[PDB]
Amino acid sequence: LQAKDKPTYCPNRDDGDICIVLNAKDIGITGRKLTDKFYRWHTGYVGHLKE
Amino acid sequence: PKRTFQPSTIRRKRNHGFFARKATKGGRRVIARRIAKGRHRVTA
Amino acid sequence: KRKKVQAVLKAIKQSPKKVNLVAALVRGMRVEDALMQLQVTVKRASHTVYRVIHAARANASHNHGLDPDRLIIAEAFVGKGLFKKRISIHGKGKCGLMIRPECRLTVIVRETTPEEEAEIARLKVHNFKKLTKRERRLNPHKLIETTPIWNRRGT
Amino acid sequence: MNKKEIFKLAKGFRGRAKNCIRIARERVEKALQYSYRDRRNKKREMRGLWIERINAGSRQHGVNYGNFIHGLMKENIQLNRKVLSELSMHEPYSFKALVDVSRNSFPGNK
Amino acid sequence: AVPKKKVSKHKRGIRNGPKALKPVPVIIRCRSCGRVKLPHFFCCSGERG
Amino acid sequence: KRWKFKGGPASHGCSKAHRKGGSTGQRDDPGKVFKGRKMPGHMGAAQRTVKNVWVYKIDPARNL
Amino acid sequence: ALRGVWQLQKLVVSYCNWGGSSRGIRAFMESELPALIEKNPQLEVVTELSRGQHPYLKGIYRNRNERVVCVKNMDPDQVLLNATRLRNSLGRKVVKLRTRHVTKHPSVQGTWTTAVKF
RNA sequence: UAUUCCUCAAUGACCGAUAGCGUACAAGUACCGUGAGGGAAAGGUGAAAAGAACCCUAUGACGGGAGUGCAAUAGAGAACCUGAGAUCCGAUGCGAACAAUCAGUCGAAGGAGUAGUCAAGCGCACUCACUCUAACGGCGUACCUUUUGCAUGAUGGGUCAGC
Ligand SMILES: [K+]
Ligand SMILES: [K+]
Ligand SMILES: [K+]
Ligand SMILES: [Mg+2]
Ligand SMILES: [Mg+2]
Ligand SMILES: [Mg+2]
Ligand SMILES: [Mg+2]
Ligand SMILES: [Mg+2]
Ligand SMILES: [Mg+2]
Ligand SMILES: [Mg+2]
Ligand SMILES: [Mg+2]
Ligand SMILES: [Mg+2]
Ligand SMILES: [Mg+2]
Ligand SMILES: [Mg+2]
Ligand SMILES: [Mg+2]
Ligand SMILES: [Mg+2]
Ligand SMILES: [Mg+2]
Ligand SMILES: [Mg+2]
Ligand SMILES: [Mg+2]
Ligand SMILES: [Mg+2]
Ligand SMILES: [Mg+2]
Ligand SMILES: [Mg+2]
Ligand SMILES: [Mg+2]
Ligand SMILES: [Mg+2]
Ligand SMILES: [Mg+2]
Ligand SMILES: [Mg+2]
Ligand SMILES: [Mg+2]
Ligand SMILES: [Mg+2]
Ligand SMILES: [Mg+2]
Ligand SMILES: [Mg+2]
Ligand SMILES: [Mg+2]
Ligand SMILES: [Mg+2]
Ligand SMILES: [Mg+2]
Ligand SMILES: [Zn+2]
C-alpha cells in the first residue's frame, strides 16, 4: 500500500496498488489471542472506557 | 465629603498677602526669591 | 479616454469602521443599484456614501465625458483623518483616553465593459443557480414599480 | 547584522514576523539554524532514498539489497548508490543485468 | 478577566466576517412620487383622495 | 429548573449566588470541565415517549 | 562560452585619475590589461573616465545582462582576478543550483513503469 | 590678587529643534498646589501670495475640472520642503471550510505572469530561462537574565521611530 516495491518510489505521493483481501473470516490467529486480546477505546465521557 | 480647601478672601490676604509676607524675615526672603526667579505673581 | 473617475470626501465626523461597514456593501455594484440600496439601508453612513457616489457620477458625467448610465463602482475605501484626543474620567480617581474619530471616503467609478454587459444580460435570465459574490453584486435585487390606485375595488 | 538584511530574509513570513524588528530577528535566526542543520540532514535523507529505490528494484527479481550490493563489491564494480538508483529507475534491463551478475557473485545464504 | 494575549488580524477578521451587511432582495419605487421603499410602506394614495 | 439543583441560601450573608450552580469541576487534574456537565440551556420541546398508558374508551363514530 | 559561442561581449573599466581609491585599477591597466586584451580577441574592452567616483568593472553579456563589480581600494591582482571571473561566467543569474546534472532525455531503455515485462 | 549683577569686540575639530539655557515660537507663560514650591508643549508653502476668478455635485468645497506657478499632494489658517516605520481600508495572481502545534527549513506535483538567443530555411529548442504562490513528505519545545540545571507553569518586554 505504501508503494515501497516500485523503483519510482517517492514518499510524498500516493501511488500504491489496490489490495483486494479475500476470505477475511479465515485469518489465522496463534496462541490464546481469541480470548486474551482486547480492543479498547475511550468515548470522551468520564468512566466510559470500552473493551 | 468636606474637602480641604474652603475659600475665604480675607484669610487668604491675611496669610499670604503682600503686607503679611513683608512683615517677617522669612516672607521677605520669599519675595526676593520670587522676584529673582521672575514670577508674575510675586504674592498671593 | 479617461478610464477611472474618483470622488473624495474628507473630514467625515464618524468612525472609519462604521463608514467601511456600509462602503463594503456597495463595492462592485452598478451606480443606480447602489443608490437604491443606500435608500433602504438604515444607517447613519448611508447618506454620506450616497453623497460621495452621487458626486462621483457627476464628476464622470461633467468633467471627463463619461456615460452616467453605464458606470460601475470599481473601488470604495476609507482612510483615517485627524483624531481628537479627550480624557475619560473613571471612578476612584483614574482616567483613560477617549478619541473622537474622523475619516475620509474615496469612491472610484469606471465604465462597464461590453463583456460585462453581456454578463449582466446573462445573469438577468431566470435560473436556480447559486450566485457568487461578484454576480450577486452585479444583480442585487428586483426593482418593482407601482402606481397608486384610488378605490381599487377591494381590500 | 543589518536591519534591512534581516528584513530581506524575513520576506514571506506569516504575521508580524516580517515587519517588526524584535519579532523578525528571532524568527530569522531560527531559520538560519534550521538551514545549517538541514545542510547535513539532506545527505542522510537522500542516501536513504537511494537505498529504498535500489532495494525496490532489486527485490523484483528476488535479490535483497544486502546481497546485491555485496555481490557488486565482490566483483569490483564501483558504481555508487546514486547511480545505481538512477539505473534502477531509468534503465531496467541494465539493472537486471547487474542483479544477475551480483547473484552469480554472492548468492548469500537462504 | 483580562485578555491573555493580543488578538491578531487573522482572528479579528474571522470574528468580524459574518457581521457584514447584505443587500435587500426586493425594492419598490412609487411611479408617481419616486420614493424608494421596502414592501409594506405607504407613500401616496391615488387621485380623488 | 432544568436539573432540580439546590442553589444557595437566601440569607446568612450569601451574595449574588442565590440560584447559580456552584462548582463546575476539580482543580488541576483534571484542569477541564467534564463532558455531560449539567449547565443552563434550552429546556423541553423535545420528543418523549410515555410507556404503558391504558386505553379506557373508544368512540368509533367520531374517531375519538 | 555556451556551445562554442562566447557570452561575455563588453568589458567596461570605469576609473578616476585623481581619487585615491583608483590606484589599484589604474596600475592594473598598465600591467595586466594588455595581456588580457591580447589573449582575448573576441572581447571588446572599453575604458571610461569618471572623475570623483569609485571605480568598477562592468560586464555586458549576450543575454542582455550587466554585472558590476566595484574595485575600490583593491590590488591589481584582485582586479585581475575579478576580471577573470567576469570573463569565465555565462552571465546567468546568481541563484541556487537546483540540479547538478541537466538532461532532457532521462532514459534510453524507457523509464520503469508498472506494465514493464522482462 | 579675587569675582561678574554689567558693557564693547572677537573666536570655536561647541549643539543644531527628544540636541543647545527650563524658554529659536509673547515662558518662569499655560497648568498643578492653601502655601513655600514644582513646571511644560509647540521651528520650515513658494523666489514672489501670484493663496485657486469661473463651472459641476453636496447643507456646506477641504472634492472633480479650469487657471497661477519650475513644480498643487508645494493647496495652509500658530500650519502646506523631503516624507521612513508601527497602524487602517482597497486591487491583481496563487493557496485556503476532512484537518492540529515557536508557524520555519530541506525537497516538491501543479497553477499564474513574463523575457532573450540564433541557425535554418522566418521554426524551435536553447538559456538548470526569470518572478509569485505551494497541495504533499522529512526534521524542528522562542529570546534575554539568573543558575548545578529552564520549552519551562522562574524574571523582563503591546509594536514602531528617536534618545
Ligand atoms: K514638490
Ligand atoms: K513543511
Ligand atoms: K513569580
Ligand atoms: Mg464611570
Ligand atoms: Mg473625584
Ligand atoms: Mg490603551
Ligand atoms: Mg483608544
Ligand atoms: Mg434542598
Ligand atoms: Mg433555598
Ligand atoms: Mg441578595
Ligand atoms: Mg459585597
Ligand atoms: Mg528644547
Ligand atoms: Mg527634524
Ligand atoms: Mg517635534
Ligand atoms: Mg493659584
Ligand atoms: Mg478654495
Ligand atoms: Mg527648497
Ligand atoms: Mg506601511
Ligand atoms: Mg485576493
Ligand atoms: Mg482541502
Ligand atoms: Mg489549530
Ligand atoms: Mg526551498
Ligand atoms: Mg514551479
Ligand atoms: Mg508556465
Ligand atoms: Mg512533529
Ligand atoms: Mg535554584
Ligand atoms: Mg555558571
Ligand atoms: Mg531542555
Ligand atoms: Mg516565562
Ligand atoms: Mg505558556
Ligand atoms: Mg529576580
Ligand atoms: Mg510582563
Ligand atoms: Mg527601538
Ligand atoms: Zn408614492
Which nucleotide is closest to the Cα of B5 by its C1'?
H34
Residue D89 is nearest to which of A4, A5, A7, comparing CB atoms? Answer: A7
Instruction: Report the distance separating Cα G89 and Cα G66, nearest Å.
Output: 12
Euclidean distance between the first and the last CA atom of chain B, given in angstroms as a whole number: 27
D14 shares contact with chain G (CB less than 8 Å): no
Neighbouring chains of F at 3+ CB pairs under 8 Å are A
Q: Name, in order, each residue with C-beta under 8 angstroms of G83's C-beta and a sequence gap of 6 or more.
A: G11, G32, G36, G57
Tell me the residue ranges of DSSP E strands in chain C: 4-12, 71-80, 84-86, 98-100, 103-111, 142-146
Which cell goes with C74?
A: 470599481
- Name the experiment that determined this structure: cryo-EM
Which nucleotide is nearest to B4 if distance is taken from CA to C1'? H34
Residue D108: left (phi > 0), alpha (psi -120 to 50), or beta?
left
Phi-psi map region of C85: left, alpha, beta (phi>0 left; psi -120 to 50 alpha) = beta
Distance between Cα C83 and ligand 7 center (Å): 10
Q: Which of F17, F29, F20 is nearest to F1 (CA)?
A: F20
Q: Are G16 and G50 contacting, i.e. CB atoms less than 8 angstroms apart?
A: yes
If 0-12 CB within 10 Å is exposed, 13-18 middle and 19+ buried, where does residue G58 land?
middle
Task: Determine the 3-state secondary structure of D104 from DSSP.
Answer: helix
Query: Which residues 95 to 134 of C reach strand H, CB within 7 A?
Result: none
Whether D98 contacts D80, CB under 8 Å: no
The three grid cell numbers given for residue E36, joined into one nine-digit string: 424608494
Report DSSP state, residue E6.
Answer: P
Would you say C28 and C131 are in contact if contact means Cβ atoms under 8 Å apart?
no
Q: In 3D, which of D55, D79, D80 has the Cα closest to residue D67?
A: D55
G61 φ, ψ (degrees, to nearest 5):
-110, 175
Cβ contacts of residue G69 below 8 Å, gap of 6+? G56, G57, G58, G59, G82, G85, G86
| Alpha-carbon gap: A41 to the closest alpha carbon of chain F (Å) | 16
Distance of CA C8 from the midpoint of ligand 1 (Å): 22
Q: If DSSP codes are grouped into helix, strand and coil, which group holds residue F17?
A: coil
Question: Residue with C-alpha cell 461590453?
Answer: C114
Please state the φ and ψ torsions of residue G8, each to the nearest 5 degrees: -75, 125
The residue assigned the cell 568589458 is: G11
The phi, psi pair for G115, rounded to 5°, reads -95, 40
Task: Tell me the nt nearest to D44, Cα to C1'.
Answer: H138
The answer to whether C24 and C125 are in contact (CB under 8 A) is no
What's the per-residue H, E or C state across C27-93?
A: CCCEHHHHHHHCCCCCCCHHHHHHHHHHHHHHHHHHCCCCCHHHEEEEEEEEEECCCEEECCECCCC
- What sign for the dihedral angle of Cα B13, B18, B21, B23? negative
Residue entry with cell 453623497: C51
The strand H neighbours among D residues 70-109, by Cβ under 7 Å, are: none
In this structure, the strands spanning E26-30 and C84-86 are unpaired
Q: Which residues of A touch D50 (CB under 8 A)?
A: none
Other C-beta atoms lying within 10 Å of the C-beta of residue C45: 22
Tell me, in angstroms, the distance from the centre of ligand 20 to residue C39's CA.
41
C-alpha to C-alpha distance for C27 and C74, rounded to whole angstroms: 7
